[PDB]
Chains A and B, each alone.
Chain A
């Protein structure tokens, strides 16, 4: 049981070669030679170039093109409760019939 002498010798040689190769895989301090050439504030600019401009574009598109055609934007009619007043008409909605309130 165990390694034969040939196995030991081959393993030792292979691991020495592997360690040499792995050491050769390293990088020199100047190894990545990069060739140079050129041709609140961060959040402030981000909120303008990523939020404000899309809001402007979509508001224009919805207000002046989408709504230019009928039935493109349909709103569920607001809920109506007794005692409310309609802005368009100004008439007051009749209240309830004074149901008997007890507990």
Chain B
């Protein structure tokens, strides 16, 4: 989510992802805590018998057959956290997220209420106004010729500088705005 993706996933990453998926579906299968702990230790052991495999052409055949086994017993109704992309409350509060720029359209009668918040709002707007002009130059000078290769942005390197393209990340509405 917050981290930029890479061009490809290494064997280590695929092994870790398979291990996590297997553990999650095992705890979905093994409802109780003691049974899950026993079978998770057993599956970690059976996953550990081939840690020190040296040749890559044989270690890729082990994970390839492990992905054929996981699919067969993958518990077609797994446990999903409520806020996860499959959970029951995934995007429940997504309609309560109102953008900050909407406050620019408030009537002056409504802006009479909450004066300190709006004063801080022009303060933030001015800060962004100078920061963006700095960041355009910083990102233009730091980019390699021909365009970026990965969508990872550099931080701020001077004293008064701010990280390039920061306005829409720090001004997230909230997790539960209302």
Contacts and interface: CB of A to CB of B under 8 A. Distances in A.
Interface in B155-178: 155-156, 162-163, 166, 169-172, 174
Interface residues of A, number: 21
A31 B117 contact: yes
Interface string A51-77: 000000000000000000000000000
A44 to B, nearest CB: 37
A10 B114 contact: no
Nearest to A34: B113
A34 B152 CA distance: 46
A6 B171 CA distance: 22
A32 B155 contact: no
Interface of A is mostly: helix
Interface in A21-39: 21, 24-25, 27-28, 31-35
Given A6-B154, A7-B152, A9-B155, A14 B114 contact: no
Contacts of A18: 169-170, 172
Interface string A40-54: 000000000000000
Contacts of A35: 112
Contacts of B113: 31-34
Interface residues of B, number: 24
Nearest to B161: A13
Contact of B116 (A1, A7, A17, A31): A31
Q: Among the interface residues B112, B153, B170, which one has the most CB atoms of the partner chain A within 10 A? A: B170
Nearest to A21: B170
B120 interface: yes
B90 interface: no
Given A6-B154, A34-B113, A13 B162 contact: yes
Interface in B122-143: 124
Contact of B163 (A10, A20, A25, A33): A10
Contacts of A14: 163, 166, 169-170
A60 B12 CA distance: 84
Interface in B92-113: 112-113
A58 B166 CA distance: 65
A13 B117 contact: no
B163 to A, nearest CB: 5
A17 B170 contact: yes
B120 A24 contact: yes
Interface of A: 1, 6-7, 9-11, 13-14, 17-18, 20-21, 24-25, 27-28, 31-35
